[PDB]
Design a protein around this ligand. Structure first.
Ligand SMILES: Cc1cncc2cccc(S(=O)(=O)N3CCCNC[C@@H]3C)c12
Ligand SMILES: Cc1cncc2cccc(S(=O)(=O)N3CCCNC[C@@H]3C)c12
Lengths: 344, 20
């Protein structure tokens, strides 16, 4: 069924693509400097560096600053992925994607300054509560459905969906962060990347893959949210991989028959049977019985009352994040890896 | 139960990405 609603979506996406392409072809560079920011506290870490809460001295606004050590990025062969991340993030604009406000680099590091999202990682809230009710999980899943509709329309694959990468804002809505493995590609791509529990079978089997991997991952996410544990787990990655390729899933006894039916279609090992990848595209998911009560337009416009609103005691509050050890930011007197990060 | 098996497993914390 094509109707007026589907035509309005098509028109919105056409205009969004025009906007994206102007920024894609002419990316912003060097729009701030380190000493414009007061560093307050570390909010999170990774392999390339860390994320810190900072205050912009001229406006008094708080932001989350991601810092990447250029030498570590080279050592781990993530040069191209880091260039993809920044070029994509500065070009996108959607209600459920974190906004990149500034970017710059110095002799040692790359910096990306984003909006501060104070509600914490969905990961934290999920492990604490155990599991979300079906209506709670559906509210979040709808936001990711609309996000992947937007991203895929721009020829982007996201490739790292998991509760650790979803933050909850003050209104209880989701913001997707970490675009470290996002790529703009027409056609197939081949890199082995993502998180073991969330990897599609075609990635593991080295087959060449496309946007359908993101729809698999959404199946994994919905299961984990509704069960409290992922569908494929073990203590060692190789044991996880074995389970993923077998095509055997067990559902908890409390899953509704409609949830089970959606998940059998998202967790389809065979590419040409997987929801999101058939002729009706994303509409096979949006029209599924599990989503019959969902008002897609109201979700987009943020008019649905969220089931959970995190506690926030004033600007600058970090109580929804864990504590981490504070390291000094070292900036060398000589420039490192200048050629490699020329376009950043 | 499966949930009890999960919470006693070695992967209940934040999961890092892998890469080539
Ligand atoms: C707290 C925070 C708050 N606001 C914006 C953010 C943007 C990116 C990453 C973070 S972050 O959570 O520090 N971050 C990276 C560290 C690894 N875990 C994934 C997670 C999403 C932000
Ligand atoms: C995105 C990209 C972007 N710009 C330059 C590039 C140069 C070489 C490889 C790539 S790449 O596609 O990132 N790449 C390397 C990473 C592993 N997968 C193989 C593939 C050829 C580039």
């Amino acid at each position: 069924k094509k109707g007026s609603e589907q035509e309005s979506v098509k028109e919105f996406l056409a205009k969004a693509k025009e906007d994206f392409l102007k920024k894609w072809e002419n990316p912003a560079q060097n729009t701030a400097h380190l000493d414009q920011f007061e560093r307050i506290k570390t909010l999170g870490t990774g392999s390339f560096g860390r994320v810190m809460l900072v205050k912009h001295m001229e406006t008094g606004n708080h932001y989350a600053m991601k810092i990447l050590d250029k030498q570590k990025v080279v050592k781990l062969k993530q040069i191209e992925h880091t260039l993809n991340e920044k070029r994509i993030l500065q070009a996108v604009n959607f209600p459920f994607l974190v906004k990149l406000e500034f970017s710059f680099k110095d002799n040692s590091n790359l910096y990306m300054v984003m909006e501060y999202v104070p509600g914490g990682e969905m990961f934290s809230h999920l492990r604490r509560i155990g599991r979300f009710s079906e209506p709670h999980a559906r509210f979040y899943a709808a936001q990711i459905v609309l996000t992947f509709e937007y991203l895929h329309s721009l020829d982007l694959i996201y490739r790292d969906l998991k509760p650790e990468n979803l933050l909850i804002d003050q209104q209880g809505y989701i913001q997707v962060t970490d675009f470290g493995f996002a790529k703009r590609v027409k056609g197939r791509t081949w890199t082995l990347c993502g998180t073991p529990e969330y990897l599609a079978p075609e990635i593991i089997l080295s087959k060449g893959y496309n946007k359908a991997v993101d729809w698999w991952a959404l199946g994994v996410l919905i299961y984990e949210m509704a069960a409290g544990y992922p569908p494929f787990f073990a203590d060692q990655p190789i044991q996880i991989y074995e389970k993923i390729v077998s095509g055997k899933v067990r559902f908890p006894s409390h899953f509704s028959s409609d949830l089970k039916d959606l998940l059998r279609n998202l967790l389809q090992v065979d590419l040409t049977k997987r929801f999101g990848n058939l002729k009706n595209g994303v509409n096979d998911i949006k029209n599924h019985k599990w989503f019959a009560t969902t008002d897609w337009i109201a979700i987009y416009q943020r008019k649905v009352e969220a089931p959970f609103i995190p506690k926030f005691k004033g600007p600058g509050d970090t109580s929804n994040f864990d504590d981490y050890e504070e390291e000094e930011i070292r900036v060398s007197i000589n420039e490192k890896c200048g050629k490699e990060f020329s376009e950043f | 139960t499966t949930y009890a098996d999960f919470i006693a497993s070695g992967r209940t914390g934040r999961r890092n990405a892998i890469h080539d």
